[PDB]
Amino acid sequence: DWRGWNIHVEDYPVSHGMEAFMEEVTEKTGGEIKGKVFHAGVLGSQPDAIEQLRLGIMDFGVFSLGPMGQAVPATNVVSLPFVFKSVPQMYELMDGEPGAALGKALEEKGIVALGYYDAGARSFYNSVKPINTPEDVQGMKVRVMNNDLFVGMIESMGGNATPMAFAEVYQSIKTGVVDGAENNPPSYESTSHFEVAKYYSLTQHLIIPECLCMSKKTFDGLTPEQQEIVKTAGKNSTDLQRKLWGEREAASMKIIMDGGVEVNEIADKSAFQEAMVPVYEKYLAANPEMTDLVNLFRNA
Ligand SMILES: O=C(O)[C@H]1O[C@@H](O)[C@H](O)[C@@H](O)[C@H]1O
Ligand SMILES: [Cl-]
Incomplete structure (x- = not known):
């Protein structure tokens, strides 16, 4: 059974995105792959969770690219202040060639990027x-x-x-x-x-993107059909999270x-x-x- 890491409270857009991901993988594999998202950082601080994922101890997670700069030096570029003009520009870049370059850098360090979640500004x-x-x-x-x-x-x-x-x-x-x-x-x-x-x-x-990702060790052990299911579920969950994010940003501002x-x-x-x-x-x-x-x- 897979273990997934989330730093956030259960009722949060990232959390719902990750649960939707895991649900879809289980559904499409007919229960062959099952897993659980562990919320509220219970499985570690973020730098330590990233290390677990690279080692194959953690199977998946959503990580801010902020703390990822230590394990994966290329990702420091998104932590530069005002480097993105706006959040829509961040989507365009991260879903395009710049994001693909960061995806390659992550893969070199044992991390398979499945999608970039929104964390606003x-x-x-x-x-x-x-x-x-x-x-x-x-x-x-x-x-x-x-x-x-x-x-x-x-x-x-x-x-x-x-x-x-x-x-x-x-x-x-x-x-x-x-x-x-x-x-x-x-x-x-x-x-x-x-x-x-x-x-x-x-x-x-x-404006710091987050990455829904898998341990490359775990990903490499999947069947080709399972890999495709995971990539599709990752993309669908990113679409969902981004939609939930917009709604939550306003709702949180109202609460504040x-x-x-x-x-x-x-x-x-x-x-x-x-x-x-x-x-x-x-x-x-x-x-x-x-x-x-x-x-x-x-x-x-
Ligand atoms: O400030 C922090 O530690 C947190 O900030 C949040 O915006 C991010 O979603 C978390 O992953 C973590 O990076
Ligand atoms: Cl942390």
Whole structure:
């Protein structure tokens, strides 16, 4: 029986996508393949789950490409701030040749990409004050995901970054040891972060695709007919998740606003973009070979 990893609560678009995937595989194989999605990160933190999947210990999962930068260096390109112009542009690129290049990089590291799930855009939330300019982040203690790029992002605005597993964030914000974090509206809402960090500032500074994927070890052990069933089910589940995502993004925004969060938009987006130049400079100085791939995205 397969085991699938999900970081999210059961009632979440990713979760429904993954369950639909597993249901379809079982249906189309006539019960020959069965499995279960394990929600709420119970089978590990995200970096550790990625390692399990590469090793064949975990059969499938939906992973943010954010933490995937350590195992699969090519994927760092999607974690660059403002690298995508919009979420629809992200779909176009990830479903096209740039996404195919990332798929090849993942395969080289033992991971078979079946589709790219939507995670919208990430924005800052905190318990201290609204963020309207990069200067507002100065001195702020901000949790980030496990990718060094994100540490650089926060430091470039004078903040103090702490890499921390997603499941630990709520308590750290609640008890006041980090001031805030950054995420899309469904994540901010579903985790109850919005109950303990009541300022949400729509910087939309990262758009990070997620990948429904399989362990290559598991995938390579399937019959050709099973492989085709898996690929089709993956595509169908991606279509479903993306549809659910749109609906949930609005629903979560409504919950956030009805819950008393002070939401502010960013008038001067240019200032945040300019503040991020050093993240690009640094990444490409440490990793010159990635220059062509980065331009494939940022110049699209
Ligand atoms: O901030 C985080 O750790 C989380 O952010 C969410 O937007 C993403 O869907 C999760 O996979 C995880 O990356
Ligand atoms: Cl995590």
